Design a protein around this nucleic acid. Sequence first.
RNA 1: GACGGAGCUUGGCCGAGAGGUCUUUCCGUCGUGCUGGGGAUAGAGCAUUGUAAUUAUUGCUCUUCAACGAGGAAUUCCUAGUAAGCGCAAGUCAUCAGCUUGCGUUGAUUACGUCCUGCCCUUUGUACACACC
Lengths: 199, 140, 85, 58, 144, 48, 88
Amino acid sequence: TPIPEEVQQAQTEIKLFNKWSFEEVEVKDASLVDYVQVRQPIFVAHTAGRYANKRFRKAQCPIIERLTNSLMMNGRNNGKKLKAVRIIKHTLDIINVLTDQNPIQVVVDAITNTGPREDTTRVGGGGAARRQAVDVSPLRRVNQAIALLTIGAREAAFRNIKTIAETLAEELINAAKGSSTSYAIKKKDELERVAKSNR
Amino acid sequence: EQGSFQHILRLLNTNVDGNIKIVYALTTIKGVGRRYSNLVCKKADVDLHKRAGELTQEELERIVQIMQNPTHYKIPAWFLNRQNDITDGKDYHTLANNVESKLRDDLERLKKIRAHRGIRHFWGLRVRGQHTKTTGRRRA
Amino acid sequence: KKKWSKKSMKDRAQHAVILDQEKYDRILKEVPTYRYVSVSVLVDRLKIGGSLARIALRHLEKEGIIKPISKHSKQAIYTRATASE
Amino acid sequence: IRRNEKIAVHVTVRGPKAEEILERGLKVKEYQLRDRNFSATGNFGFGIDEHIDLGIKY
Amino acid sequence: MPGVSVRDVAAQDFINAYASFLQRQGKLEVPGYVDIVKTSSGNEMPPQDAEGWFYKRAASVARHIYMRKQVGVGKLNKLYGGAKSRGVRPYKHIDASGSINRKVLQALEKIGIVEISPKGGRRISENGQRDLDRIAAQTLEEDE
Amino acid sequence: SHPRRYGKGSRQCRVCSSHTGLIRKYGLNICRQCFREKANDIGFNKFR
Amino acid sequence: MTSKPAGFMKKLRAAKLAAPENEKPAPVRTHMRNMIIVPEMIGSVVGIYNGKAFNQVEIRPEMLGHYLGEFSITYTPVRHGRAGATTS
RNA sequence: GACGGAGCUUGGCCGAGAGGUCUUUCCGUCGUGCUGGGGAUAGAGCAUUGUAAUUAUUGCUCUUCAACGAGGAAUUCCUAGUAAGCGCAAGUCAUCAGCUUGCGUUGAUUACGUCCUGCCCUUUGUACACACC
């Protein structure tokens, strides 16, 4: 005889903190969508050493997993995962609360906007150093997107009287709505400015 | 309902910090740690949460008396005569001016002692022998 | 330094922000744009202190005008209103 | 090098105005203060912050 | 469900519930020892009154005891506390905890809660489990 | 003729003449490396 | 003014030899005089010998030891013995 | 993050810390403050190791409250339980900053390639041959 966990007395049970659904989330960009896996996550975590393999579609990824991990990290020093998950658990809820839309969908929207079209590697050749503009490679767009969004959130927390979760929500929403106030979009638009020009 | 409030304190002499809660505010009083500070509040009978600035006049006046010497605690110098200098005066609290101006004397006293601690005070050098591989570059 | 105000508790005690102005303007006015907003986002946008927003939320809670949920870091969400369900 | 500008500021008080400031003013600075502070003239002066005196610091 | 709940709730909701019951005991004499700085560097007592210093230290220790046992003065002291080796610039913390433990343990002996071994440490009595378990009865109903 | 003392302290082999050393076994800290090959004690044969 | 046996210090008190101890009451009876050439740090300071000529030889130089009013509640070797601040 | 409380070795009366023995991760607190940051330096005084602690013990009650606002020209490694971070015990050792050193615990990012440096084999040239110093 029961007692047990309270959820719904069931159906298919949506997990992802038990709060939100992943399947509804659309990646508009046809190119981008392929790399971004959301055919069947939750939020628990996991490593798996998928290996670098190149050219064709490389590995599995969860967007969320990447976002928590960047936060613990950047930065700099001395961040633990129990706090790092916690801040996101709350951040997702702040984001949902601001938008009235699925937090994963906003995360997607942020990342797709912040991920530039083109970049600007620095090559020495002959007697001088040129930038000819360089590939984006679809995971690297994603990685850069998250990193940029993540530095911005940190920068705000440090400077202003705000906990991370809100700085992270704010920076993400702002990117997710195409406003230059976010660090992440401002750098995207710069990086694509420089890459187009330097050709 | 107010007070038209803000606060300026002399406190010990000429000093104001303020705008923080009394226990934490008090630590900044020369003489109290976090460790001393909380005890003085409850002995005075002011709450922890209330700011050192925010208080009414009677509560603030009790702070001035209590901190310098309180009811249940007290320390009078005792010993037979002499030793003369320096002495301990039974752990002066008494902190603030009387502590800072005490060590100024204690130094000359330590010199009239002929201590090394007194000769170094005369030599002028880092007192208790610091390392020289590197350091002191901001200091001078 | 630059300087420095909203600043609490002394402003909290005196009438100027507690009475009406802060609870009605800041907390209550924000809510019609977003049904819920987090206690900490709400701190930062309003420019109101975390401690300062916290008692105001609590008065409002008692009233039944707002309803909080929780989380440890005294973060949570703040909601006003809501319904027929 | 400009000599026309305000380098400083001063107050002359006389009479009761002088006495009320002397009352608070003497009270900070402890005493029995020294005779050396006094001039040949029968004058004395001491220095200290404005902050000393019953006054709002704010 | 309740008795078993002494053992099986998350510690805090247990300690919070329990501390109000403790509050009733006559004892709770701190006599001025606490006042110096019991622990690392900002440890004083005025937040102690609700579930402080002293009162959580008892309430919980009892929560700990039920599950575990046997114990002693030593066992208690760092259970809570640090005192890590120092890269020699530090402290993190100094937890003393030699005075602290002694004060908590003393009160308990007077009421009759805790008993003392020759080799073993601190054991719980018939008296000690009874109060813990009986209060636990109230706890579970509130929670669900 | 009278007597003397002071500069007591730890131990070292005969096989090597230096004071500084490791006590458990009873020889000096290189003598110990020579000894480590030998095996003598339960353990050390070699290698890690 | 008045003296009592007993004196406080920090964890310094116990047995001993004799060799500097024995020499020190001699300047009392004979009267004030030459400095006393003792390296020996070992002796805790006591009130009886106060205001008398002393020496210590750390190693190469002599260093005049004089006992002051102020040099009382000290340890003896402290002054000239600590520094060797023989540099400028 | 910083604070407090909370998730050769004793038992236990008893201690400011250090000790002596009859005796075997939640929540008060923080307001992003050169401070509740940081602990530098200073000074008096107390116990233990030792015969001694002053240039040359360690622990500090207590109080001075130092620079430093994340670091130039520049560097070192590291290819997933690895970088980086929390501690502990061993050895050291009468004492001793942590040396050197192993156990667990926390836990990330990038890993295509040879696209300044070390190397390999072949290749040619060589006026070098203790050898491009």
